Amino acid sequence: NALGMIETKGLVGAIEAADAMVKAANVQLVGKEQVGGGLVTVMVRGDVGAVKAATDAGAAAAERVGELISVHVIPRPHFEVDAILP
Amino acid sequence: ANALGMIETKGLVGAIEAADAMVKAANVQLVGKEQVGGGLVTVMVRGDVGAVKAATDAGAAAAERVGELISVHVIPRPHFEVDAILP
Amino acid sequence: ASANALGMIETKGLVGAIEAADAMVKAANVQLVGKEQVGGGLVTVMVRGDVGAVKAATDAGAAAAERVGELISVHVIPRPHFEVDAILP
Amino acid sequence: NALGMIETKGLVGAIEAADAMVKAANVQLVGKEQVGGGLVTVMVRGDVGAVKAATDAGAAAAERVGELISVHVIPRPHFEVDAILP
Amino acid sequence: ANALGMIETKGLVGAIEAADAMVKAANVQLVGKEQVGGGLVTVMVRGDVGAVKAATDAGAAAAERVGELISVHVIPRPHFEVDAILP
Amino acid sequence: ASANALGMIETKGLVGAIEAADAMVKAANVQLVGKEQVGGGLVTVMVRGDVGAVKAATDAGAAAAERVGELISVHVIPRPHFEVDAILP
User: Fold this and answer.
1) Which region, left, alpha or beta, applies to residue C69 given φ > 0 means left and ψ of -120 to 50 means alpha?
2) Contact E40 F36 (CB under 8 A)
3) Which domains does chain E have, with CATH numbers?
4) Which of F13, F14, F19 is facing A74, going by the closest CB pair?
5) For chains C and D, what is the number of CB pairs under 8 angstroms?
6) How buried is C66 (Cβ within 10 angstroms: 0-12 exposed, 13-18 middle, 19+ buried)?
7) Distance CA E37, CA F39 (A)
8) Nearest residue of A to residue B44 by CA position?
9) Is D56 helix (H, G, I), strand (E, B) or coil?
10) Chain A 45-64, CB below 8 Å of chain B: which residues?
11) Whose CA is closest to C86, among B20, B59, D83, B1?
12) Residue in C44, C84, C86 closest to B13 by CB
């Protein structure tokens, strides 16, 4: 139940990232969050290997259409963290 | 009619002009606009792949004329889970 | 078929937008249909009417915004499609 | 029925402006608007002379505690403009 | 107990530390916080003039320690119409 | 009397905040009480608990935020007044 996250400056890069992630591997899109300042984060859940593959694909995609700001995976997130996810 | 075209501008005027140019350039459907702060506005259309490419190219040119274009992209066949984060 | 003409003025700041709006409705027989704000301090005011009225209004509004130092964008769409009409204030 | 407007970057300057305006002359506070980007506008209504006096006082005050961005008076605003005021 | 003290910071942490320092420095009442975008957060207290001056000075020092202070001001006797635009 | 200790981490970006939050709750017995966003991309995550637990959590969270490049502010208030408690998530 790993968590993968990609943050972009702009919604277009985030949607491209999200689409590339769920196409690339056996992950599920948890949703998107807009925190202001133009930053948009999209997130997926799945096995750690699938989430690594998905986030690599998403980050490559975001970078080509937009502004990749960050990409990270948390392999075993703590249950409380779900409270602040989309 | 599943392809998705997206145009993002800094400013609303650019996005409205983009949306109007899109729907006039080809038979595509305007599905909404989203604002994410810092002035960034995105407008999106759906349609068949060819129409969406033509529309998004036209929209991008229109946004460049009146405003500030930030991003332009077409996804020919979005994953079904992606529909759930669209406006 | 097309929807009524649309004139739009975008300013950095609300004061410029209100000055623009006031000048627009004073200059011509147009309807002020609202304002929208998209962050970063950008505010857009919009009018609808006949094409000539909207052109005259928007030119007056742009001048007023530029006078007080706020003008980012100005544009008229003489014959907007209804699809777009549907995403306006 | 003149309209006076002061825009500041920050709420503190706007509240100081508003307080100084209504203290300075026979004007009424219409309200405040926050348009994003940190910009806050406060507005008053009254006779043109009162609104000129009020806005001068408010602008002087905003400048001392904060960031005055703009100050302007519209002497005879058109009725449609009320639709987009606070 | 009508005086108004206001502290504005870029960032929420600075504002929370300011608010805590204010209410600990003197007998003043925290009346709320407001966010106006671009990261700017304002916290406000009410109290008697002396207390509010002391509290706001303490709050400002606390905000400077942990964050970014933007503005600090005390209005001893706000106009009654000003209450209507406060949080 | 005072309310439970409070630890806060502010980051530029949500990814840094989630990394911080995860590290905080992993490092100590604290309650994650929420996140707040105030524009400009700034996100704050907060935990409550006993003072020592909150100190340990917040130190772990700050490290994690700094590792991924996002850290703006970090602070613990060991004994917050309830008035403040009242304006938190």
Assistant:
1) left
2) no
3) 1-87 (3.30.70.1710)
4) F19
5) 70
6) middle
7) 5
8) A12
9) helix
10) none
11) B20
12) C44
Residues in chain D with CB shorter than 8 Å from the CB of E68 are: none
Say what the resolution is, in angstroms: 1.6
The closest of C23, C2, C27, C9 to C78, measured between CA atoms, is C2
Question: Could you tell me the two tokens for C49?
Answer: 């009417």
Residue A41 burial by CB count (10 A; 0-12/13-18/19+): exposed, middle or buried? buried
Nearest Cα of chain F lies from the Cα of B85 at a distance, in angstroms, of: 17
Chain breaks in chain B (C to N over 2.5 A) after: none
Of D7, D37, D78, the CB nearest to C22: D78
Residue in chain A closest to B78 (alpha carbons) equals A19
- D29–E84 CB contact, under 8 Å: yes
Interface contact flag, B23 C74, Cβ < 8 Å: no
How far, in Å, CA of B11 to CA of B68, rounded? 7
Q: Which tokens sit at B42?
A: 């995105």
One-letter amino acid of B79: H
- CA torsion E86-E59-E35-D69 (nearest 10°) is 80
Task: Say which experimental method was used.
Answer: X-ray
**Among residues 10-49 of chain C, which lie with CB inside 8 Å of chain B?**
10, 36, 38-42, 44
Measured between beta carbons, the chain E residues lying within 8 angstroms of C39 are 37
Q: Which amino acid is at B70?
A: I
The alpha carbon of residue C82 and the mean position of all alpha carbons in its chain are separated, in whole angstroms, by 18
CB E36 within 8 A of CB E63: no
- Given a contact cutoff of 8 angstroms between Cβ atoms, the answer to whether B74 and B56 are in contact is yes
Nearest by Cα to A67 from A17, A19, A25, A30: A17
Give the Cα separation of D83 and C83 in Å (integer): 25
d(CA C10, CA C35): 9
Pairwise CA distance, residues C57 & C76, whole Å: 10
CA distance D32 to D10: 12
H helix intervals, chain D: 11-24, 48-65
- In DSSP terms, which residues pair with F48 in a beta bridge? F6, F31
